[PDB]
């Protein structure tokens, strides 16, 4: 002994599965979480999953010799439309090494130096609109940080102008993007998909569908023409091959890899650049730290790749951000072999762990006590910080790819930001947040007046 496992409330038949008929399933389950402690058990109709909430358990599941990424019921649904993608696929299934291999260079120091000036151009977009706003007006900030996301990817990525900030409403591909992410929450709380009932459904899903691989169309063929080509991720989905294997992608999987890094590339970095201005306004002090390193590092009209690098401050502003609200909140692991963990608990081949990250973030025994407070001077020694205690990018080989792409485009953009406007919270907001899979905050608007510096170029 050993344990043995706390589970939450059940309902006969469905078990857990009426605990998440809600529209924030997440935030639930931290609440169960808060509760029952490190450990829980969750079990729907015919599918059981423990999720862990603290660290001395998750570094454990982190150990790549004894669990492995886990397609959880959410990314099977996602699979759907991302298909095999780098997200979807299992780590042993030929298309995710081939591709991670392919794709890799896409996101070596020497892209990103390159898709810097691209970076500023969606940002320079931003600003221009904020410094464009009459007096009377107000920001709607992640509809404009998916506005500044979606178009940065895009363009660093396809070279392909989504012009967000042509459009007062969203884009047609978020708009569908939602939809489908929406109805992939959806089907995790119904366990009876056959039903008529849901016949409307799975029609608009498709229709949604259709609206994403008609876009992929386009990004494709403006890259068959083109000529002054560029030497970005799409041009090594097309010319790359995996010296592994010896071989190219195939058109199936490249499509798939478009709709992949056209959303888990901009959709969780809109959420980061939302909860961070959020974080800065309920905390006006470190927003004023924020603002000064911004101030005394950005003396040019437009910043450079090392001067974005020399944003400290902002950085650990960032982090402290993916801390208290980590935007891809959840990931799966499977136990490779029968394997006991922690000392405490046996689990089968095969079993379910899902570390439930913005709880790891909570940890007592690890961040101190003050844990619900907004602090980015945590992160100023890292080397405190024990091993797998901060996941926000996920874990081992399985970990983002586009990391730094988040961080980089993330800190010129809120570093910009704050060298060029003071932000107030007109409305005192209070946060709502969304649950589409990832978490976003809801209604959150600001007003910002401009400090009237000069901008525009490169
Ligand atoms: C704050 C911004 C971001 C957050 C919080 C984030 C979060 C994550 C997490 C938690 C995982 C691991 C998933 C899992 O274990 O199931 C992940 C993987 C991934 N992310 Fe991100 N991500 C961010 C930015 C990006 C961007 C900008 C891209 C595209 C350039 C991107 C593309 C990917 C891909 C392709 C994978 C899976 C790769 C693989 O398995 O090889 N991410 N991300
Ligand atoms: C942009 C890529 C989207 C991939 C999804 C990343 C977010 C992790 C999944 C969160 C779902 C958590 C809800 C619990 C689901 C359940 O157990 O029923």
């Known amino acids: 002994t050993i344990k043995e496992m706390p589970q939450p409330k059940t309902f006969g038949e469905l078990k857990n599965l009426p605990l998440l008929n809600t529209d924030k399933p997440v935030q639930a389950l931290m609440k169960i979480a808060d509760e029952l402690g490190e450990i829980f058990k969750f ?16 570094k454990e599941a982190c150990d790549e010799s004894r669990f492995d990424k886990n397609l959880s019921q959410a990314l099977k649904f996602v699979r759907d439309f991302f298909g095999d993608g780098l997200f979807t696929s299992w780590t042993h299934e030929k298309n995710w090494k081939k591709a991670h291999n392919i794709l890799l260079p896409s996101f070596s120091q020497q892209a990103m130096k390159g898709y810097h000036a691209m ?25 404009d940080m998916t506005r500044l996301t979606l178009d940065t990817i895009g363009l660093c990525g396809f070279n392909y102008r989504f012009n967000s900030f042509y459009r007062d409403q969203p884009h047609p591909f978020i708009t569908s993007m939602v939809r489908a992410l929406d109805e992939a929450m959806n089907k995790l709380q119904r366990a009876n998909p056959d039903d008529p009932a849901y016949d409307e459904n799975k029609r608009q899903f498709q229709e949604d569908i259709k609206v994403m691989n008609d876009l992929v169309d386009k990004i494709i063929a403006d890259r ?82 090392k001067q974005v690098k020399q944003l400290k401050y902002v950085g650990m502003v960032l982090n402290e951000a993916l801390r208290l609200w980590p935007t891809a909140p959840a990931f799966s692991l499977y136990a490779k072999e029968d394997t006991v963990l922690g000392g405490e608990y046996p689990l089968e081949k095969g079993d379910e762990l899902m570390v439930l990250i913005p709880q790891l973030h909570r940890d007592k025994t690890i961040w101190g006590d003050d844990v619900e407070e907004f602090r980015p001077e945590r992160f100023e020694n890292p080397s405190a910080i024990p091993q797998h205690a901060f996941k926000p990018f996920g874990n081992g080989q399985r970990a983002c790819i586009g990391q730094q792409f988040a961080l980089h485009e993330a800190t010129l953009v809120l570093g910009m930001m704050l060298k060029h406007f003071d ?24 007003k910002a007046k401009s400090k009237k510096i000069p901008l525009g170029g490169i």
Do not use: C
């Not at 079990?43 to 358990?57: F, N």
């Not at 932000?423 to 600001?446: A, W």
């Open 423 to 446: 932000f107030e919270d007109h409305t005192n907001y209070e946060l709502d947040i969304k649950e589409t899979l990832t978490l976003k905050p809801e209604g959150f608007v600001v």
């Open 43 to 58: 079990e729907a109709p015919g599918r059981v999953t423990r999720y862990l909430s603290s660290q001395r358990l998750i």
């Open 119 to 143: 970076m500023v151009d969606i940002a320079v977009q931003l600003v221009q609109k904020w410094e464009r706003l009459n007096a009377d007006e107000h920001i709607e900030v992640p509809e």
């Open 224 to 305: 068959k023409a083109s000529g002054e080509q560029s030497d970005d991720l799409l041009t090594h989905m097309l010319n790359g091959k995996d010296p592994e294997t010896g071989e190219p992608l195939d058109d199936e999987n490249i499509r798939y890899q478009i709709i992949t890094f056209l959303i888990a590339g901009h959709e969780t970095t809109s959420g980061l650049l939302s909860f961070a201005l959020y974080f800065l306004v309920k905390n006006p002090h470190v927003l004023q730290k924020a603002a000064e390193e911004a101030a005394r590092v950005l003396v040019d009209p437009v910043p450079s790749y």
